[PDB]
Design a protein around this ligand. Structure first.
Ligand SMILES: [Cl-]
Ligand SMILES: [Zn+2]
Length: 214
């Protein structure tokens, strides 16, 4: 698809400029945690909470496949179904998620998007609600995952190691953003990463990041 027009040191610079604490960490220091992506795993949200997921090992993007629609300015249910099928055809099981406290509005990213919190960054709002979106993804062969508990993330990992990912730990949470996946889907990587950063910020998450590189 597209390529990383931005380097790791710059990502760190951009984040710090947004008021973040950021540093670069080598993949070799996480040999124990970095997992090769499993094609049977759902491409899911960066959310650090536990859930009822049984399809582990998939890439992590804000709102699951919503990160792709959001980055591309795709705002219709038909377009979302197209993306769902596209993701399935590209090696991952597509998904979106809700939670127990707010049901389908349980994904903070989609709620931020639907409510216009990305208005100032110039993003077109979706033209469907969280219930409509979830059911469209399901009807197109995707998965609706359900999270539980409170957001207790302590750090954000921005993984740039292609084909690998990190998994949720509900008792020692972290946001995980597979930046390499944005390139795989031809997304504007810089916008994707800035949106992921804004998401953590607006969800009142920790503005501390570790950028993982080969
Ligand atoms: Cl979420
Ligand atoms: Zn979410």
């Amino acid at each position: 698809g597209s390529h990383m027009s931005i380097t790791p040191p710059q990502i760190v610079s951009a984040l710090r400029g947004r008021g973040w604490k950021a540093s670069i960490v080598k993949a070799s220091t996480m040999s124990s945690e970095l997992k090769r992506v499993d094609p049977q795993g759902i491409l899911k949200c960066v959310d650090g909470r536990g859930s009822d997921n049984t399809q582990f090992g998939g890439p992590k993007m804000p709102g699951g496949i919503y990160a792709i629609a959001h980055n591309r300015g795709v705002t219709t249910l038909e377009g979302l179904k197209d993306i769902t099928r596209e993701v399935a055809s590209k090696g991952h099981v597509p998904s979106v998620h809700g939670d127990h406290s707010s049901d389908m509005l349980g994904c903070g990213f989609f709620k931020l998007w639907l409510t216009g919190r990305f208005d100032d960054m110039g993003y077109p709002r979706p033209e469907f609600d969280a219930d409509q979106g979830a059911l469209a993804v399901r009807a197109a062969g995707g998965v609706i995952e359900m999270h539980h508990g409170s957001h207790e993330e302590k750090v954000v990992y921005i993984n740039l190691v292609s084909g690998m990912t990190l998994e949720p730990n509900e008792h020692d949470q972290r946001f995980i953003v597979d930046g390499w996946a944005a390139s795989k889907f031809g997304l504007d990587v810089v916008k994707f990463l800035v949106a992921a950063a804004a998401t953590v910020e607006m969800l009142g998450g920790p503005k501390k990041a570790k950028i993982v590189i080969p």
